[PDB]
Design a protein around this ligand. Structure first.
Ligand SMILES: NC(=O)C1=CN([C@@H]2O[C@H](COP(=O)(O)OP(=O)(O)OC[C@H]3O[C@@H](n4cnc5c(N)ncnc54)[C@H](OP(=O)(O)O)[C@@H]3O)[C@@H](O)[C@H]2O)C=CC1
Ligand SMILES: [Zn+2]
Lengths: 134, 86, 146, 341, 125, 95, 114, 207
């Protein structure tokens, strides 16, 4: 088990459903011996004699730009095109639609409160589930 | 030492990426049909120089500038990657 | 209100399995060395990784680069997306291309197999805003959720 | 790790080193440097003291608020030892005396007390134990001091098998009884030496080197159960060393030969003092004992410390032994001593 | 008599800052978001420059929040984004600039509450 | 009331107590842990509920301007008592 | 880019003032060690002086150089007149600061500071 | 004369306004702005080249006679390209009047020393150099005055941290006081005090 940082404890990049990249900021530091997540992997790569070529947060974000240049365009919504090509390729292989009706995982409010590891450990979220089921 | 992944960066509106835009429009569908299991990641971003990235085994990457290439030149840059593996 | 989960069940120290098979606190030096030793002894499809829901992009690319350097390409996510056809080759295949603010300009919305109220509460709030103010017509294929 | 001992900060005065250390014998030459280095990085230091609280005051500025804790103890009261070690993660034993007293002989301070501290520490779950012995410890030694060190070092390794045992040569520093001892022979005119100091070799080590070696032993997992020998970088003839001491201090050097039986007789003369004897028979023996060569033991370099030459620090100890005429003389004015290659 | 100096302004060597706190810091240039607990907008007028948050730990004696970051409380105020960027450049700090967020102009109408045939009709006042 | 932990250390009115294994309790060896004995949570419970004949009562803690700011307390719910938010005194509406 | 100078019209004149300051410091180290009764050698003192000049070798603005020289002369005067005490002279050698390793792994083990 | 409101004095306001433009008429080469506050204090804002001509005129002119330099100080405004405002407060005993003269400079531009005009300015300029790092040309003896020997930085700049960068303690090993990076047992707690509601409409800046 390698203890990493939560989203409140690191400056990290997330892309929302629009494709808009945004970055968190460090509010507090990770607890105990926990460490920034990308540093753990960079540290491991050196111990295994496979050192990744970036020592700072700025450099690893340069590496992000080399893989998908939109991941460093913070707060910008970058248009994506070629829906025609995607539809053309989506016809090549036919697959069957099942008879199962489309049922979402969350059907009422009680299913809304505990979905991730943080919310599952929240005592407040447990109060909300208890409130809407008793 | 084979080919693992191809990435194509381009701008949606710059004239320098026009050839890359044409290639995707006309030849990407056929290119993907010949390499079903080859990830060919197209990533558009405003005002970037078009580039072709190729990742080989054990994380070796090389990139080729596609700035002002015509659609025919893009097909060669990709043909060299898909064949002259390394 | 979920931030109080950040003060509970936290992982604060590296852990390894002891000789009875139970997790015990150890140093960063010891923990990484046991991981590095295994990483140095496996190649290709013998090494895989799974990224969870709250993982940042910096860790994602760092993990990908580390696994690629042992010639592994099994970098997976838990959340499925069909790979048939364009797969993830084209961003438009897996994006909300109309954008959230665009909901306010739509005149029809078709929701297929989703419960935006709980999946994206603020996105659903945006739909109700357009339903209220632009007389948006909304139709849903799926279960009749509220 | 218990949450309260996870290191935090940048290794400064207000940081948290994670070290909770009981330092027995912290009120002496080696104690003040060890406590200084622990408090520098925000360790919790427990200082059990036998002395009058006035004599511990110099330790108070060494740690942030609440980080130095003082307790009373008695080397024969095993309960008082338990109170001082039951909360610590490491225990350091620096207890020792260069002369026997009416109440405590070399066996008490070098065998009984070190054994009792190690025993209580083991029973109390103390995880680390650092014990200072002596480089020249030997059951065959002609010095009771060195014979008791050999016995005490054996008993410590049995009570606390995982102990780190450190064996320093003669340690030189500002408050040492080494360079200061030679410089203080000047009040008797000539400098007596057994065989004119040509039969003895010493390899003295700087105080800060020993201190840094102790601190690294605490943090080094490999140091558990080992025995180290802390020696300086150079071996000198006792005659050349004392000649260098008088040159650095710019005092006239008048060595003369004194046979062993004669030196012993004067040693007893100074043992009459009920206070702190200027010299003793045992002290004369240890100064003229050759510093053992122990290639099989690890040393300071094994703990990361780079031994400090005596040539760079002698002035720091010996400048105060000069007269006004020579006070301002610089370090390079005196030529070094012949080092036994 | 004036002289010509065409190089960029770099005062990092005559400000006396330790090198660690020049090259390892990350200044954020932004206009503070409105506190959502209040409607007043007077605290969203000026540009601010702050630095990256660093470790705080509990003081063993009291439990107080200790820090070793000298810049933990440093916040500067600037009239414009250009002023803040220029200050960051000459002092050698890398920085991120966040564009000002201005509330969208809204179309408000009391009459819509009583619409004959629209959904904006309110059921209560 | 002030309890003691299984280690014997007294528990404060805020529930503080060094746990079994916390080194920081060495600061109390040879000295003592200062602990106020009069727990205000228990003292305020000792007070009796005051019966009033109006829907709304006011409290200022007593002593006039030596008390706390004057507040008004609603006594319409019969399932519970109105509590002063400053001093904790309790009120109830008689029948 | 027309700015009022401090002393030097251009870098050529500024580097002349730099060399003059270096000579003054270089000659002064032997007296500083002797007067302050420091336990370091003249070689260490002059190496430290050299290290202080070197950290600023990358400057190209004459005005910045002039201010560095002005401060250097102020520092030298404080030393020559024994306005400084031994503690001030020795603060250049940071004798009590523990080593802070400057490689990624070492920092990773100790904390979050980059 | 409402009891809680400070009363106005228009006679002083008028007199100071007239003298303000009198100074602007006589020294147009250097005067950039003249203003009188609502509590009757006159300020002359000048080009820095005019420090000596302007201060000499106010000291020696028969209709000015500002013989006393009450105060000389600086203010740091990081948002300005010339961040340092230099402020001279002068007193005229003959006319029982005060005047403020203000100029500006940046980190790298020297200001002419006013010691020739006012011997009082000597230590004030040393303090400004010490606390702000503004260099004064032709000062007979410019050096730190308030900070510790060898102190690095200029504490009164807005970007100098409140607690600085180093702190002192006594170290037994080296037997002297040493300087080490600052660590605080309790960090200073920054308070955000400003109300989000405007207080003074009369001073509202245009949007
Ligand atoms: N040249 C050297 O200095 C060398 C020293 N060592 C060993 O290092 C250790 C310390 O060295 P140093 O610090 O120089 O010795 P010091 O005599 O300078 O200090 C000795 C410490 O032991 C304590 N002590 C002595 N006798 C008793 C006693 N009967 N009961 C309780 N406490 C006692 C003293 O406390 P109080 O202040 O109350 O007397 C003092 O704190 C000793 O074990 C010594 O043998 C090893 C090699 C060389
Ligand atoms: Zn009340």
């Amino acid at each position: 088990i390698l203890p990493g940082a939560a989203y409140t404890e690191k400056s990290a990049t997330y892309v929302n459903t629009e494709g808009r990249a945004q970055q968190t900021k460090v509010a507090v530091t990770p607890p105990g011996l926990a460490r920034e997540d990308w540093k753990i992997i960079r540290a491991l790569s050196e111990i295994a004699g496979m050192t990744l070529p970036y020592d700072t947060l700025d450099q690893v974000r340069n590496r992000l730009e080399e893989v998908s240049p939109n991941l460093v365009r913070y707060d910008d919504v970058e248009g994506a095109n070629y829906f025609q090509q995607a539809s053309e390729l989506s016809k090549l292989v036919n697959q069957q639609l099942l008879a199962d009706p489309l049922v979402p995982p969350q059907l009422t409010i009680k299913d809304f409160y505990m979905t991730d590891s943080i919310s599952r450990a929240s005592q407040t979220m447990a109060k909300c589930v208890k409130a809407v089921t008793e | 030492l084979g080919l693992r992944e191809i990435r194509i960066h381009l701008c949606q509106r710059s004239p320098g990426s026009q050839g890359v835009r044409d290639f995707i429009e006309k030849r990407y569908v056929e290119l993907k049909k010949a390499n079903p299991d080859l990830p060919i990641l197209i990533r558009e971003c405003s005002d970037v120089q078009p580039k072709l990235w190729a990742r080989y085994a054990f994380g070796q990457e090389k990139n080729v500038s596609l700035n002002n290439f015509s659609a025919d030149q893009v097909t060669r840059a990709l043909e060299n990657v898909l064949s002259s593996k390394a | 209100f979920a931030y109080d989960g950040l003060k509970r069940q936290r992982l604060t120290e590296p852990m390894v399995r002891n000789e009875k098979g139970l997790l015990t606190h150890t140093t960063w030096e010891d923990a990484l060395s046991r991981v590095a030793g295994m990483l140095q002894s496996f190649q290709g499809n013998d090494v895989a990784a799974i990224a969870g829901g709250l993982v940042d992009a910096e860790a994602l690319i760092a993990l990908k680069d580390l696994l690629n350097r042992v010639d592994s390409d099994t970098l997976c996510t838990e959340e499925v997306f069909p790979t048939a056809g364009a797969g993830t080759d084209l961003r438009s295949n897996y994006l909300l291309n109309t954008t959230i603010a665009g909901v306010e300009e739509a005149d029809v919305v078709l929701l297929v197999g989703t419960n935006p109220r709980f999946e994206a509460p603020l996105f659903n709030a945006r739909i109700r805003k357009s339903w209220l103010h632009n007389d948006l017509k909304v139709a849903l294929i799926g279960s009749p959720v509220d | 790790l218990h949450h309260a001992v996870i290191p935090h900060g940048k290794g400064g005065r207000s940081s948290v080193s994670g070290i909770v250390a009981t330092v027995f014998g912290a009120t002496g030459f080696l104690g003040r440097y060890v406590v200084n280095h622990l408090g520098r990085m925000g360790s919790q230091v427990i200082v059990p003291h036998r002395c009058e609280p006035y004599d511990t005051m110099h330790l108070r500025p060494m740690g942030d608020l609440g980080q130095i804790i003082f307790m009373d103890w008695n080397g024969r009261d095993k309960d008082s030892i338990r109170r001082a070690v039951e909360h610590s993660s490491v225990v350091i034993n620096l207890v020792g005396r260069e002369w026997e007293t009416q109440n405590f002989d070399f066996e008490d301070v070098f065998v009984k007390i070190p054994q009792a501290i190690a025993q209580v520490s083991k029973e109390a779950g103390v995880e680390k134990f650092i014990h200072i012995s002596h480089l020249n410890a030997d059951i065959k030694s002609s010095s009771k001091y060195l014979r008791s060190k050999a016995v005490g070092e054996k008993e410590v390794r049995e009570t606390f098998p995982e102990a780190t045992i450190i064996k320093p040569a003669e340690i030189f520093g500002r408050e040492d009884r080494f360079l200061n001892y030679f410089a203080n022979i000047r009040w008797f005119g000539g400098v007596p030496l057994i065989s004119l100091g040509k039969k003895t070799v010493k390899q003295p080590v700087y105080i800060v080197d020993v201190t840094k070696g102790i601190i690294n032993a605490i943090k080094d997992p490999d140091a558990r159960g080992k025995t180290f020998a802390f020696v300086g970088p150079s071996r000198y003839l006792l005659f050349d060393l004392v000649q260098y001491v008088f040159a650095v201090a710019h005092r006239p050097f008048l060595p003369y030969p004194l046979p062993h039986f004669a030196y012993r007789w004067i040693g007893r003369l100074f043992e009459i003092s009920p206070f702190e004897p200027w010299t003793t028979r045992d002290k004369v023996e240890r100064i003229h004992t050759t510093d053992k060569i122990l290639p099989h033991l690890p040393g300071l370099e094994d703990l990361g410390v780079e031994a400090t030459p005596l040539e760079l620090k002698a002035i720091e100890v010996l400048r105060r032994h000069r007269t006004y005429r020579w006070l301002s003389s610089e370090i390079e004015d005196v030529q070094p001593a012949k080092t036994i290659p | 008599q004036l002289i010509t100096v065409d190089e960029k302004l770099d005062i990092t060597t005559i400000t006396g800052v330790p090198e660690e706190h020049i090259k390892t810091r990350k200044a954020r240039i932004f206009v503070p978001a409105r506190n959502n607990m209040q409607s007043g907008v007077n605290n969203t007028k000026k540009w601010k420059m702050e630095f990256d948050t660093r470790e705080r730990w509990e003081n063993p004696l009291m439990g107080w929040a200790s820090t070793a970051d000298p810049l933990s409380n440093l916040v500067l105020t600037f009239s414009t984004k250009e002023d803040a960027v220029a200050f960051a450049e000459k002092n050698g700090w890398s920085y991120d600039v966040e564009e000002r967020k201005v509330p969208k102009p809204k179309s408000k109408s009391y009459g819509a509450n009583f619409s004959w045939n629209k959904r904006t009709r309110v059921s209560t006042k | 009331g002030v309890r003691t932990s299984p280690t014997g250390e007294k528990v404060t009115h805020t529930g503080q107590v060094y746990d079994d294994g916390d080194y920081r309790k060495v600061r109390f060896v040879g000295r003592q842990k200062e602990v106020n004995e009069n727990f205000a949570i228990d003292l305020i419970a000792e007070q009796p509920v005051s019966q009033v004949g109006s829907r709304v009562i006011s409290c200022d803690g007593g002593g006039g301007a030596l008390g706390h700011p004057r507040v008004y307390i609603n006594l319409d719910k019969e399932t519970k008592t109105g509590t002063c938010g400053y001093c904790g005194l309790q009120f109830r509406q008689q029948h | 880019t027309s700015v009022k100078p401090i002393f030097s019209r251009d870098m050529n004149e500024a580097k002349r003032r730099v060399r003059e300051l270096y000579r003054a410091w270089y000659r002064e180290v032997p007296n500083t060690v002797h007067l302050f009764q420091l336990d370091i050698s003249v070689k260490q003192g002059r190496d430290k002086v050299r290290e202080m000049f070197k950290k600023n070798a990358h400057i190209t603005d004459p005005r910045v150089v002039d201010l560095l020289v002005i401060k250097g002369k102020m520092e030298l005067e404080e030393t020559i007149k024994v306005w400084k005490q031994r503690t001030h002279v020795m603060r250049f050698f940071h004798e009590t600061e523990a080593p802070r390793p400057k490689d990624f792994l070492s920092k990773f083990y100790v904390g979050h500071d980059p | 004369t409402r009891p809680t409101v400070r009363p106005r004095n228009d006679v002083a306001h008028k007199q100071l306004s007239a003298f303000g433009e009198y100074v602007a008429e006589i020294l147009p080469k250097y005067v950039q702005q003249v203003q009188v506050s609502c509590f009757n204090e006159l300020e002359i804002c000048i080009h820095p080249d005019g420090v000596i001509p302007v201060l000499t005129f106010l000291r020696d002119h028969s209709n000015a006679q500002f013989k006393s330099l009450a105060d000389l100080t600086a203010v740091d405004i990081p948002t300005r390209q010339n961040r340092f405002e230099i402020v001279y407060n002068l007193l005229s005993l003959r006319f029982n009047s005060r005047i403020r003269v203000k100029t500006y400079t940046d980190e790298l531009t020297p200001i002419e020393s006013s010691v020739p005009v006012y011997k009082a300015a000597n230590w004030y300029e040393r303090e400004i150099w010490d606390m702000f790092g503004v260099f004064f040309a032709n000062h007979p003896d410019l050096r730190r005055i308030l900070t510790d020997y060898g102190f690095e930085g200029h504490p009164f700049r807005k970007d100098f941290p409140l607690s600085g960068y180093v702190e002192l303690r006594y170290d037994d090993e080296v037997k002297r006081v040493v300087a080490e990076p600052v660590e605080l047992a309790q960090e200073f707690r920054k308070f955000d005090l400003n109300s989000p509601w405007e207080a003074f409409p009369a001073y509202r800046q245009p949007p």
